[PDB]
């Protein structure tokens, strides 16, 4: 009748995740996600010089540290009254934009591609499920392998681009309250542009085409994994110095309807989370982190964030859906050639196909393409030699919030400063929105709900369970912190 399947560790994601699903008549009919590892950055940050935060918060997650760095300095800029020079804003975008490219490339090839591509007879590519449902021709499988290897060079080059104005990566030194620590010189801009060109080539010629092509051999995967079909974007990549227009404009989508994003509507629930019951339902500005690992009923160190009581998902899909940009020229051609679809903007594909397992991989590939244009824009806008930082004094009393989009979705950092020290620091991260447990009202998290209906016609090889999860690109370091 009903079979429970627990997968711990879910692999080929970042961090510690357990998935437990119930399977009835060949489908997932229930799901619970557990983030199994906790560090407690929100309490570790208490009492430090607020400038230290932009270093500490990066160790939340070594795959997306520039997202945390960015959110933190934006929070500190606000709290310190610091006016980031124009050239510093652009430099920051160059540092952070380069890791979007690394992160999406890492995710598709090095995390996700083994879900569809058979690796060779060497560890860690073997052993695996005897019935792994790997459907690609010898030729397309070989392209998959060839590109996973090439991608190892490309993603490393991305990190080289990050380090040029960033200092090193993981964990940039180059972003601080007040802007960026190093003025781009003509020479180093030549170096960033030369590497960006090789990345651009790979994304256009290899990555976007392979996601569509592999996608075309797994069309059933566009029909499952919808969940709530509700999305959040909080905005990212300031495009002028006045905080108005952004590369990704904020918005919420739910039940077929677009609405504005109002961060006061965010509450984090803890009934099913290992935190003290009296801390449930707080906005981040009043957020508290009191761990309760023995609490009865709870099953995760991830809190449950709700927007106006809604369970929402985040990430490239959510951003591309909210913003609805033009599809890339590769996507447009491949949609036509391989799927028989003529589309012009992202939403032309329809809610059902966009919010599906494979739709999320396609949204990530498209967003990567969309990021090339933004970076090329910043490379034109940047001015060699122009100052990129101001040096503000630490205030005795202040508060600040930084909102941005991490490669995996919406991120914000709130800081409260008192006696020139951190009094409260709260983080609401991307994978916190996606991989969270039930809220106090028993409503499931986005990935939990997206698991409902996933096919498992063979309980001994239940491959689609981790496949659905991996389409969200989870990082539980971010989710839990």
């Amino acid at each position: 009748g009903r079979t429970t399947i627990a997968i711990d560790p879910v692999t080929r994601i970042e961090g510690h995740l357990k998935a437990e699903v119930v399977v009835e008549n060949g489908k997932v009919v229930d799901a619970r996600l557990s983030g199994g590892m906790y560090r407690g950055f929100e309490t570790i940050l208490r009492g430090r010089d607020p400038r230290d935060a932009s270093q500490i918060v990066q160790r939340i997650c070594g795959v997306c540290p520039t997202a945390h760095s960015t959110a933190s300095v934006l929070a500190l800029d606000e709290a310190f009254g610091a006016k980031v020079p124009n050239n510093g804003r652009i430099t920051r975008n160059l540092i952070f934009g380069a890791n979007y490219l690394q992160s999406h490339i890492l995710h598709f090839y090095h995390l996700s591609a083994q879900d569809f591509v058979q690796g060779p007879d060497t560890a860690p590519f073997v052993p695996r499920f005897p019935k792994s449902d790997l459907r690609l021709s010898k030729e397309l499988n070989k392209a998959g392998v060839d590109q996973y290897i090439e991608a190892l060079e490309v993603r490393r080059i991305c990190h080289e681009m990050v380090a040029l104005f960033g200092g090193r990566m993981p964990h940039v030194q180059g972003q601080v309250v007040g802007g960026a620590t190093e003025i781009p010189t003509k020479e180093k801009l030549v170096e960033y542009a030369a590497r960006f060109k090789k990345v651009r080539d790979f994304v256009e010629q290899k990555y976007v085409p392979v996601v569509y092509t592999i996608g075309s051999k797994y069309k059933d995967m566009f029909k499952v994994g919808q969940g709530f079909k509700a999305a959040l974007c909080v905005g990212a990549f300031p495009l002028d110095n006045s905080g108005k227009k952004h590369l990704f404009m904020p918005g919420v989508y739910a039940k077929g309807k677009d609405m504005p994003f109002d961060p006061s509507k965010i509450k984090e629930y803890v009934k099913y989370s290992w935190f003290a019951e009296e801390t449930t339902g707080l906005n981040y500005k009043e957020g508290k982190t009191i761990p309760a690992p023995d609490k009865a009923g709870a099953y995760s160190f991830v809190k449950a964030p709700r927007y106006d009581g809604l369970s929402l998902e985040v990430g490239p899909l959510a951003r591309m859906w909210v913003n609805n940009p033009e599809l890339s020229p590769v996507g447009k051609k491949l949609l036509k050639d391989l799927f028989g679809i003529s589309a012009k903007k992202f939403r032309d594909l329809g809610e059902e196909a966009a919010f599906s397992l494979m739709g999320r991989h396609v949204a990530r590939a498209e967003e990567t393409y969309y990021m090339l244009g933004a970076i090329e824009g910043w490379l034109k806008e940047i001015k060699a030699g122009e100052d990129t930082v101001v040096m503000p004094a630490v205030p005795a009393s202040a508060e600040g919030t930084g909102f941005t989009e991490a490669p995996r979705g919406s991120l914000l950092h709130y800081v409260k400063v008192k006696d020139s020290k951190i009094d409260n620091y709260q983080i609401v991260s991307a994978s916190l929105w996606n991989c969270n447990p039930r809220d106090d009202m028993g409503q499931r998290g986005a990935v939990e709900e997206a698991l409902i209906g996933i096919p498992v016609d063979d309980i001994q090889n239940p491959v689609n369970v981790a496949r659905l999860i991996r389409a969200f690109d989870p990082x539980l370091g971010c989710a839990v912190h």
Partner: protein, 277 residues
């Protein structure tokens, strides 16, 4: 090909990402010919209890002969429940359990990253999880398996591949036993290889003259003066960043901003505030 199991406790996966940045000419050979990376949750094909069972089967077949890479600290509070790394036979496996199971039967343990080496950020002021350095945990539990620390937050990939290579050479010359004896001959009192951590950043810093002159940059973007007043921790830090630099030689912390002493046992607390002398 001896197996390697890569276990993550309280880490941020940054030690795996830094390794993926390696340009070391030996790295592909290490992974394809030298060892077999049999368990690594971020990159391996299999999952869950299947992955765990595979690790356990290989551990048994290679008892005494496999190597453990540990990334992240080990939290001991609340009976190990702040880090659960898997489940098999209906039993959650904490990082505490995993180290007590695999620790005794490994040939050696590489604690990669300042977390595993020394506690690092998860152990810093305000933390509540009992996060513990690998070597201390193993000792507290009477496990005598040798440990080498490769610290840094994250380490330079060449420090990781570098230590494997110097370990590989020591074993080829003298066996598993003679080999390991020779590697202690190059570890400092903090258990780290003196080839990478034997030299002080500040004594080898290109801005040393400015430091001696008393010329201090007042803003991060002034690349002419010493970074000391901006918070540079170079004077108290032992690493070769000044020479090899980071990410294919394109930059390093002191050129770009300041050194935060990421390789040192007191990181981060003893290095904080980061942006004041």
């Amino acid at each position: 090909r001896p197996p390697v199991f890569w276990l993550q406790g309280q880490g941020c996966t940054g030690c795996s990402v830094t390794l993926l940045n390696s340009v070391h000419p030996s790295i592909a050979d290490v992974l394809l010919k030298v060892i077999s990376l049999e368990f690594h949750p971020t990159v391996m094909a299999w999952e869950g209890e299947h992955a765990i069972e595979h690790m356990r089967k290989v551990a048994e077949k290679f008892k005494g002969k496999f190597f453990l890479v540990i990334e992240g600290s080990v939290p001991v509070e609340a009976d190990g429940k702040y880090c659960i790394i898997g489940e098999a036979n209906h039993h959650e496996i904490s990082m505490v359990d995993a180290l007590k199971e695999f620790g005794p039967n490994a040939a050696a343990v590489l604690a990669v990253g300042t977390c595993a080496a020394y506690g690092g950020i998860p152990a810093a002021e305000g933390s509540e999880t009992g996060a513990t350095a690998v070597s201390k945990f193993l000792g507290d539990n009477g496990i005598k398996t040798p440990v080498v620390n490769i610290p840094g937050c994250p380490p330079h990939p060449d420090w990781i591949v570098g230590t494997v290579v110097l370990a590989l050479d020591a074993i080829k010359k003298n066996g598993l036993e003679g080999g390991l004896a020779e590697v202690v001959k190059v570890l400092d009192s903090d258990g780290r290889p003196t080839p990478f951590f034997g030299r002080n950043i500040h004594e080898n810093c290109p801005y040393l003259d400015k430091y001696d002159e008393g010329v201090m940059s007042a803003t991060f973007t002034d690349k002419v003066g010493c970074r000391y007043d901006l918070g540079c921790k170079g004077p108290m830090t032992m690493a070769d960043c000044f020479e090899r630099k980071w990410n294919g030689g394109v930059n390093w912390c002191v050129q770009n901003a300041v050194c935060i002493g990421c390789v040192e046992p007191d990181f981060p607390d003893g290095k904080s505030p980061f942006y004041q002398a």
